[PDB]
Design an enzyme around this catalytic site. Sequence first.
Site, mmCIF file in Angstrom:
data_model
loop_
_atom_site.group_PDB
_atom_site.id
_atom_site.type_symbol
_atom_site.label_atom_id
_atom_site.label_comp_id
_atom_site.label_asym_id
_atom_site.label_seq_id
_atom_site.Cartn_x
_atom_site.Cartn_y
_atom_site.Cartn_z
ATOM 1 N N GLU A 249 -62.120 5.928 15.107
ATOM 2 C CA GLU A 249 -61.933 7.374 15.007
ATOM 3 C C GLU A 249 -60.469 7.736 14.794
ATOM 4 O OE1 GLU A 249 -64.029 8.371 18.618
ATOM 5 O OE2 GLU A 249 -65.921 7.866 17.615
ATOM 6 N N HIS B 191 -59.067 2.320 17.670
ATOM 7 C CA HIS B 191 -60.425 2.823 17.529
ATOM 8 C C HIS B 191 -60.632 3.422 16.138
ATOM 9 C CE1 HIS B 191 -64.175 4.961 18.214
ATOM 10 N NE2 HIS B 191 -64.335 4.162 19.259
ATOM 11 N N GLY C 135 -69.965 3.705 24.170
ATOM 12 C CA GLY C 135 -69.669 5.093 23.852
ATOM 13 C C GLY C 135 -70.467 6.067 24.712
ATOM 14 N N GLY C 136 -71.390 6.792 24.083
ATOM 15 C CA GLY C 136 -72.079 7.875 24.770
ATOM 16 C C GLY C 136 -72.766 7.525 26.075
ATOM 17 N N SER D 42 -73.666 0.505 18.952
ATOM 18 C CA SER D 42 -74.533 1.231 19.897
ATOM 19 C C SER D 42 -74.994 0.335 21.051
ATOM 20 C CB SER D 42 -75.734 1.863 19.192
ATOM 21 O OG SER D 42 -76.676 2.344 20.149
ATOM 22 N N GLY E 194 -74.099 6.419 12.146
ATOM 23 C CA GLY E 194 -74.774 7.507 11.448
ATOM 24 C C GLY E 194 -75.926 7.125 10.526
ATOM 25 N N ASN F 157 -65.931 3.993 27.010
ATOM 26 C CA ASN F 157 -65.026 4.871 26.266
ATOM 27 C C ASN F 157 -65.625 6.264 26.291
ATOM 28 O OD1 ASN F 157 -63.254 6.154 24.515
ATOM 29 N ND2 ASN F 157 -63.937 5.007 22.700
ATOM 30 N N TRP F 158 -65.080 7.128 27.141
ATOM 31 C CA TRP F 158 -65.657 8.460 27.306
ATOM 32 C C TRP F 158 -65.377 9.340 26.112
ATOM 33 C CZ3 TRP F 158 -64.175 10.286 32.927
ATOM 34 C CH2 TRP F 158 -64.641 9.347 33.847
ATOM 35 N N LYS F 159 -64.431 8.942 25.266
ATOM 36 C CA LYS F 159 -63.989 9.764 24.141
ATOM 37 C C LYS F 159 -63.575 11.154 24.622
ATOM 38 C CE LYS F 159 -66.699 6.967 20.973
ATOM 39 N NZ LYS F 159 -67.543 7.009 19.698
ATOM 40 N N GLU G 121 -66.322 -3.019 16.243
ATOM 41 C CA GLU G 121 -67.109 -1.818 15.929
ATOM 42 C C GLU G 121 -67.697 -1.914 14.533
ATOM 43 O OE1 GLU G 121 -65.293 2.244 16.719
ATOM 44 O OE2 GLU G 121 -63.453 1.052 16.556
#
Lengths: 251, 251
Positions: free
Chosen positions: B99, B97, B236-237, B215, B175, B12-14, B169
């Site tokens: 977000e 998602h 993700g990242g 993560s 965070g 998921n490149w977001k 998720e």
Amino acid sequence: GSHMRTPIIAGNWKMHYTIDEAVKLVEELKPLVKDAKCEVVVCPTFVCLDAVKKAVEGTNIKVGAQNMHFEEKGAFTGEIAPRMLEAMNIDYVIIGHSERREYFNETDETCNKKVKAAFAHNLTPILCCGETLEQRENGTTNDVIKAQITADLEGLTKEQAEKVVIAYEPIWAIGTGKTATSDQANETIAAIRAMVAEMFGQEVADKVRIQYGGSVKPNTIAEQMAKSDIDGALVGGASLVAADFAQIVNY
Amino acid sequence: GSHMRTPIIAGNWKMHYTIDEAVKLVEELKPLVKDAKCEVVVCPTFVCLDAVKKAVEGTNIKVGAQNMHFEEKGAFTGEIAPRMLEAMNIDYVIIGHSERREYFNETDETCNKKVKAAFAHNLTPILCCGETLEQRENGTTNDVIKAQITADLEGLTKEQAEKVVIAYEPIWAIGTGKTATSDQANETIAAIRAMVAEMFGQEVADKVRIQYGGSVKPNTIAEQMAKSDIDGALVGGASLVAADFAQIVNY
Ligand code: NA
Ligand code: NA
Ligand code: NA
Ligand code: NA
Ligand code: NA
Ligand code: NA
């Protein structure tokens, strides 16, 4: 009328057309709007933007996105960054459409961040505003829209403010037996111009283009454009049909 | 383990990468994932989808969208219709998602409508679910996720249900100083499989792929994939860097 303001007619296609359908529509449109006496913008869906912008190269048809985010990049699944539009040479971006304020939690705070980001990325924002049926019935139209304008345009320079295109959407008339009249439209649009003047000064107000964004059809545009303070139209459904959109452009 | 379920790793490149940057990344990725022992999906932003899908033709790299609407067409400024993705031959679509649930008023009702629309348009949905820090702390993880699964998968046939890819998720860990452990991940994922069984029956539960979507880094994937009920990863990242994503794919 005395003041020079280039009129602008923008077609908001909303959620319509695949890539090939989008390109077919702009191909039909090109010869019909080549002599326009106004700026002409079409706003396809995100997946169509690159194809549409490439198709209209060499013509007077400009291209707008229907939304964007305000950050450069980041953890916003489903969102499009201003730099992604800029890399495609997109010209305009619609910010704050009533449909996004209603369904997708667009706030005035995010609208303001998006307008600032537009200027930082060579995009001209089309900022949408407008009041509900209940707000109009309660006599709060101008207070409500002033709150939107104050918040959405906060922090701009004069040079940026005069380049914003503001579109007034009479949400109150959406889904009823009677559309706003040209006089009702012009009165609220003149009020918006006064809100701009109080924020940015008379010269900026004299220059800012303010579109009407309620129901616009080939048979309404001439009367709408003849009004003292109306500088154009953010067109919905009529923008989906080449001949109809061209009639509105050639008002 | 005994049950046959093709593993699936989806990036998921977001909100990252222009068209040219997106194509450069998939070009780098192609030789690094050609021998993958799992299904491989990359999910670029909307404006990049056509270019990315065209770039990966002939390879094992599938393409997903990061969101879509549920209607065929209509007055939803800024939204992308399922048929627009289908016309580009997009393979997957991420739905729900965290977000979008947090920032953009995605509800379980709209998630359900989107999952049904995916099946109607030759798209495989990646349905995201998961609980907050407060929900986990209050001991309500399974009740909360059951409510999401019940609502989001309402009305599917068995044949459709077994094709959904569910991504768990752990929003609660986003965070903080510590990510979910592989055991915590596997326990909640096994619970989700039990929710699917209660809704659709044992055969469907045995077949549905359930990814972990917290993560995921090159140094975590081997342990994560070794767990009894984990069928893949929604990354993700780490999906933004070709070599890192390839390490996760080649676990
Ligand atoms: Na009036
Ligand atoms: Na009208
Ligand atoms: Na006028
Ligand atoms: Na646990
Ligand atoms: Na982890
Ligand atoms: Na496993």
